[PDB]
Symmetry: D2
Subunit: 115 residues, 4 copies
């Protein structure tokens, strides 16, 4: 599991469950092509997005559908979604954990990179 | 204005208005003595807490009454309040801006020293 | 100033100066077309990006070139840039302030709509 | 494990290791009495601070010694430490995870509460 996503809810003090996540990889023509997708579990985590063999060097975009999350809770959020863009495995295979803390008008994202 | 406080509401996307703020300075006996206090304005800011002459080197604590803020909005918050403890260096001309972003179960605080 | 951008540096406790910011508006064909751009001032702010007449309802993207900022400081950052995508409602008098707090491997963004 | 602490480093993109944490409980005389303490592990976590039997209702303060952490890395931080104050178990036993994201001049803390 080289890529993991963790989403938390800052308003309810709980994991953000059933949040849709789409991952894209920048193609040779500067276009974003679908790479993987899924929904966060009851623990607010999403594992098994890819494998070490498939997760090659490149620029990846992790899109978290925050809008749908807040709408489902009856809250009108500011952002359409939260995006995290980064170059991965540029100096060898690494394990990436992308974390996001969500609020209606704000969000924070941090990355923990392991070797 | 050597010391300024700015509070924002992450749930409503607006300044946090009428939030009580208490500032304390560590005394010679490791005790926290009242230094200044006030409430944030409509812009979520609090200015005029002290002057350059009074704001001497020392350890200060800025306490933001976040609990009362959320209660007034009908939200049960996690924290009793938010505290920011820092040392004023006073090594050259310096203004301190303490900013806090509030959510019911989370808050972030940052300091901008210019 | 219907739209304002504020960027802070969480590592140095100062405004993030000379940070490139590009704003885009979603076109009729789901494409992002250039809308406005600039660089943050010494106060870490960027004003005068647009006017009320030009800032119509739509989906906008504010892209902050964080990578170049950290590289200039000799720090290898994680993100390529920071993006803020939002819908301008235009339901009554509204000013939008997009704030970003930057760290090498993390950033927070908040919107204050008044 | 009713009380857990997780600390991350926003500058290095890694867990904050060996960070001293002190927990206090408000006594009958408005005084803070020592409750438990420890240091974060290599995963930036601190478990086994207390047990369900000992963790009774009350106001607790979790103090994270952030200053020593940054000093050890050669960075002059702004805060003396990070404090998290909250009432616990007021409506029954709960599990609390206190998370902190650290930067030299900024920190964020969030709580995840489970039943
Ligand atoms: O493990 C836990 O029990 C755990 C409990 C609560 C929260 C987190 C937890 O794990 C992690 C891990 C990890 O476990 O390897 C790695 C990165 C982020 C998080 N994570 C997280 C998510 C969003 C924001 C923040 C932060 F803002 F507080 F930093 C931290």
């Amino acid at each position: 599991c080289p890529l993991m996503v963790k989403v938390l809810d800052a308003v309810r003090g709980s994991p953000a469950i059933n949040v849709a996540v789409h991952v894209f990889r920048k193609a040779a023509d500067d276009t974003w092509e679908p790479f993987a997708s899924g929904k966060t579990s009851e623990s607010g985590e999403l594992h098994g997005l890819t494998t070490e063999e498939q997760f090659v060097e490149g620029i990846y975009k992790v899109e978290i559908d925050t809008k749908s999350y807040w709408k489902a809770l009856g809250i009108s959020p500011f952002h359409e979604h939260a995006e995290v863009v980064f170059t991965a495995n540029d100096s060898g295979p690494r394990r990436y954990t992308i974390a996001a803390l969500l609020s209606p008008y704000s969000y924070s994202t941090t990355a923990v990179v392991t070797n």
